[PDB]
């Protein structure tokens, strides 16, 4: 990498809700420029999460491209969230640097769809569902999620995450295709 300018857009504050409304506003900004704006490395991560409980974040240290970081600077579709949301400016960066990656991608961690397929095809009985349907149906762990509004459940929901281990080497790539990361930029330093 021969460039030292990589930033992103963090979450904006407001008093009309908890941080789930800020997560919904960040999902709207991602659908406008980052997640629903195409490309691989268009997401929103945060290095303010602990590995013991899968926290969501407390600050904003973004790392993405230039168009997705410069389209959410003067757009008029961020009313209210732009009452507290802001940022600084660009500058130069250091010459050396590592290639570390951590993000959250769309994984298959729901035992409802596979169970629905096994009910539409297998037609399991009681003892047959207790023996052939194994004890790997409670598939859920503590992951980073915020209150996502959508017509899939009644109220707001949660979500998991998944990334890979990085090092001090050099490399570059993209994140998931839903507004997350798979080895992209996260908050570190």
């Amino acid at each position: 990498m021969a460039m030292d300018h990589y930033l992103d857009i963090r979450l904006r504050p407001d008093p009309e809700f908890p941080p789930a409304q800020l997560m919904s506003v960040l999902f709207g900004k991602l659908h406008q420029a980052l997640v629903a704006q195409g490309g691989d490395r268009i997401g929103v991560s945060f290095p303010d999460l602990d590995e013991s409980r899968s926290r969501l974040g407390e600050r904003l240290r973004i790392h993405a491209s230039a168009d997705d970081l410069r389209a959410l600077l003067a757009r008029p579709w961020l009313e209210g969230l732009r009452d507290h949301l802001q940022f600084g400016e660009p500058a130069v960066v250091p010459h050396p640097t590592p290639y570390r990656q951590v993000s959250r991608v769309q994984a298959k961690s729901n035992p409802e769809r596979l169970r629905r397929r096994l009910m539409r095809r297998h037609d399991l009985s009681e003892e047959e569902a207790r023996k052939r349907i194994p004890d790997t149906v409670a598939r859920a762990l503590d992951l980073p999620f915020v209150t996502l509004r959508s017509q899939s459940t009644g109220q707001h929901f949660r979500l998991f995450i998944r990334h890979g281990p990085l090092q001090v080497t050099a490399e570059e790539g993209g994140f998931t295709c839903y507004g997350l990361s798979k080895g992209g930029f996260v908050p570190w330093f």
Binding site: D14, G80, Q151, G154
Partner: protein, 293 residues
């Protein structure tokens, strides 16, 4: 010279419930008899309805008046403590009027803070307000909550005009009755939001509505005076008041940002505090509520 036993102060700015109805885009010049929101059921039981697949602008329909008369407690016992309270309130009335509180309530009525989650999703949040003393129009108003910010204290000329007319209703010598009609462009096939009981929703006669205490606490969102981090701006105003969705206590009793220290020094000791602390005192005396142990 001591405290009275039971202090009753009724709710000024007394609100009502917020009806919902659905209209379409560019069909909204006749917003008088739109079809309302009925309670649907889909498969705990989540009986939460959606907007229809044709209409998208949710007309939120509610009104508001001002009782007034905060110079007299609705229940007291003492004679000299009451004379001290009456002369202190008369000192404020001879000191300054209701302009600042009316403009801050206009800041509440300029953005869409009264819609707690219904603000996100809408495209052009237009606030239609008529003037009512009888069953007709006398003066009209149109807003937009995307050109008007959320946290920033700004008072435009139209907001100053509406806040001045509200303050003319507020001063105790003239009655005003102003409603709010908002347009939540939720979409064609997206969720309606009534208030929730203790799913456990709320509904009215052949329609759906939202509770009134949530409006009554949303319109008093003034509090920028908590010492930890004021990057979030205005929050709810109560003695020991804060937001209960975060989990953090604002206006600590360890500092002097409490109403009770202000009332004790402001009535008993004659150690009168400053102007903005008196604005907080009269804000949480104009919200109503119980006082006294």
């Amino acid at each position: 010279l001591s405290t009275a036993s039971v202090l009753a102060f009724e709710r000024k700015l007394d609100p009502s419930d917020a009806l919902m109805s659905a209209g379409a885009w560019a069909q909204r010049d006749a917003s008088q008899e739109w079809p309302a929101v009925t309670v649907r059921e889909k498969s705990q039981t989540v009986d939460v309805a959606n907007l229809p697949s044709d209409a998208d602008t949710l007309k939120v329909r509610f009104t508001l008046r001002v009782l007034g008369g905060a110079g007299t407690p609705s229940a007291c016992n003492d004679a000299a403590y009451r004379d001290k309270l009456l002369q202190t309130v008369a000192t404020y009335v001879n000191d300054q009027g209701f302009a600042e509180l009316a403009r801050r309530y206009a800041h509440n009525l300029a953005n869409a803070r009264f819609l707690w989650r219904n603000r996100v999703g809408a495209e052009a949040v237009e606030v239609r307000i008529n003037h009512i003393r009888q069953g007709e129009v006398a003066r009209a108003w149109r807003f937009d909550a995307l050109a008007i910010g959320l946290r920033d204290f700004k008072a435009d000329a139209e907001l100053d005009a509406l806040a001045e007319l509200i303050a003319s209703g507020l001063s105790g010598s003239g009655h005003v009755l102003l409603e709010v009609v908002a347009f939540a462009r939720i979409g064609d096939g997206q969720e309606v939001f009534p208030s929730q009981e203790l799913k456990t929703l709320y509904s009215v006669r052949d329609a759906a509505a939202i509770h009134s205490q949530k409006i009554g606490n949303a319109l008093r969102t003034i509090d920028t005076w908590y010492p930890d981090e004021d990057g979030l701006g205005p929050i709810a105003v109560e003695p020991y008041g804060s937001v209960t969705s975060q989990g953090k206590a604002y206006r600590q009793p360890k500092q002097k940002l409490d109403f009770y220290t202000l009332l004790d020094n402001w009535v008993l000791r004659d150690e009168a505090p400053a102007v903005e602390q008196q604005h907080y005192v009269i804000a949480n005396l104009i919200r109503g509520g119980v006082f006294g142990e």
